[PDB]
């Protein structure tokens, strides 16, 4: 007997993968791709066409101030992106010329921070600046500003100005209470439509009564058994998860980059591990062990990677945007470049892709 608490009680009462077949990166990639885009392409396409007929209902529910939550088995990334960009935004734009901007949150990324997300939201829709009396005593300038947004948008026509799409809301860095509180407070605003998706089976455990009231979800089940190739990019599949490091996504970026950018990143990693070894394994990279931008410019000029500091900053913009390297100003006023990965991760990056 199974499928019941009694089954759990009944079941809750020396081979290794050493002798399992050996598979290379290329073999795994090609087999997975061929079994992802050719196994059941026709049934999954037919199912998607079937569930594409419920888009008017999704838009209607969003119009009445309901955040949409999509759960199921498979990759809902394509579903959410197509629904939002290809259907929701043009339809809202015509019903209200330019389309409604969509902020596509990639929650499966372990390097998703609410500071940058709120900066993007502020850029997209300009709020009133937080005044001196409203900053409080070391108050959270994000939460207070969002409450100011709520008060401002409470008395204003109920149009839609932004459509923020939350891919994999239960991801390693997007599941934390701080960003969940940010999304909860943003969900009160009726002038932004929220289309989120969840993959974890215990996802409802995240939200208490207050957060589940602010979200105001209407749960929709879209199971499609999709490969989820994009979500699995940011962590190794052969290790079987043996999550929040983010070094695997960095490596995946490193196969597809310019040779000059690869050389610059390799030099930065080498010098940062030199600094870490001078200081002291499992410790992350911070600005304490990092290169100064002037010193880095001198090194790159010595190695002909960058002619001037402007070009070096232009190259570093891509790595900073992808949350791969961070430039932060210390007490002395120096600006320091540091890669937020551990010594082992940097060594693996140098051995595998940067060799």
């Amino acid at each position: 007997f199974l499928d019941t608490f009694e089954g759990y009680f009944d079941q809750r009462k020396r081979h290794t993968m050493s002798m399992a077949p050996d598979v290379t990166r290329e073999e795994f990639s090609l087999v997975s791709n061929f079994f992802n885009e050719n196994f059941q392409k026709r049934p999954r396409q037919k199912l998607f066409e079937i569930q594409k007929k419920m888009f008017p209902q999704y838009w209607f529910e969003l119009t009445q101030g309901f955040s949409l939550l999509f759960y199921g088995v498979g990759s809902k990334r394509n579903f959410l992106e197509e629904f939002a960009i290809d259907y929701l935004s043009p339809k809202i734009a015509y019903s209200q010329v330019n389309s409604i901007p969509c902020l596509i949150l990639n929650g499966y990324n372990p390097s998703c921070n609410y500071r940058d997300v709120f900066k993007e939201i502020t850029d997209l829709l300009v709020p009133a600046e937080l005044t001196r009396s409203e900053t409080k005593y070391w108050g959270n300038h994000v939460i207070l500003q969002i409450q100011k947004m709520i008060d401002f948008y409470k008395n204003q026509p109920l149009d839609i100005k932004l459509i923020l799409v939350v891919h994999n809301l239960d991801g390693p860095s997007i599941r934390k209470n701080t960003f969940q509180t940010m999304l909860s407070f943003l969900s009160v605003i009726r002038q932004i439509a929220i289309v989120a998706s969840t993959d974890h089976i215990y996802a409802p455990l995240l939200w208490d009564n207050m957060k589940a009231q602010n979200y105001n979800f209407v749960f929709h089940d879209i199971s499609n058994f999709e490969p989820s190739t994009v979500e699995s990019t940011f962590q190794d599949v052969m290790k079987m998860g043996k999550t929040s490091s983010g070094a695997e996504g960095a490596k995946y970026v490193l196969q597809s980059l310019t040779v000059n950018s690869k050389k610059m990143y390799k030099l930065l990693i080498e010098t940062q591990m030199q600094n870490m070894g001078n200081l002291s394994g499992p410790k992350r990279g911070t600005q304490r062990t990092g290169v100064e931008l002037k010193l880095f410019n001198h090194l790159c000029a010595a190695d002909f990677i960058a002619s001037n500091e402007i070009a070096l900053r232009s190259m570093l913009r891509e790595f900073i945007e992808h949350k791969m390297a961070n430039i932060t100003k210390n007490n002395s006023g120096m600006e320091i470049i540091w890669v937020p990965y551990t010594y082992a991760e940097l060594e693996k990056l140098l051995k595998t892709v940067l060799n």
């Binding site: 199974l2 499928d3 419920m54 209902q57």
Partner: protein, 156 residues
């Protein structure tokens, strides 16, 4: 007291006769006897398992004739209190639900449901939309079209 019998011994003749009297095709009956042979290890109550399994098989094979007539299925369970001689019906529900739980994911049951288009008694074209959460579901607030048609035929 056929249900309470423990580890009773029977043969293939009784099983094939039970399949035949409920009008079960040959291939599905052979699948039934093969499932019985492979699950003989779990024969704490062989009559219970076999009666529940044939109940589910009859529901799958004749789901659409059941769809016309709301009586027939009840009329069907009349056999279960006459042929095997036990008037209890609650134990019948117990048997059918436990055997549904036992063979919920097996390949043969899935193939039978696929080729008969049953999906727990509800066709795929509408089970997919009920699962998706569409507002346009076939709500039971009105009666089905076939019921209206047969009622009109009766009244005329």
């Amino acid at each position: 007291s056929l249900l309470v019998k423990k580890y009773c011994k029977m043969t293939t003749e009784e099983i094939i006769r039970l399949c035949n009297d409920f009008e079960l095709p040959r291939e599905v009956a052979y699948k039934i006897v093969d499932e019985y042979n492979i699950n003989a290890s779990r024969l704490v109550c062989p009559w219970q398992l076999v009666c529940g399994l044939v109940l589910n098989c009859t529901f799958i094979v004749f789901n659409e004739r059941r769809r016309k007539d709301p009586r027939i299925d009840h009329f069907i369970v009349s056999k279960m209190c006459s042929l095997m001689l036990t008037s209890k019906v609650d134990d019948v529900i117990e048997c059918v639900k436990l055997v549904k739980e036992l063979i919920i994911g097996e390949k043969w049951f899935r193939d039978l449901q696929i080729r008969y288009d049953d999906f727990d008694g509800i066709r795929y074209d509408e089970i997919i939309f009920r699962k998706l959460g569409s507002m346009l579901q076939t709500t039971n607030i009105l009666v089905t079209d076939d019921q209206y048609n047969i009622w009109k035929k009766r009244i005329e």
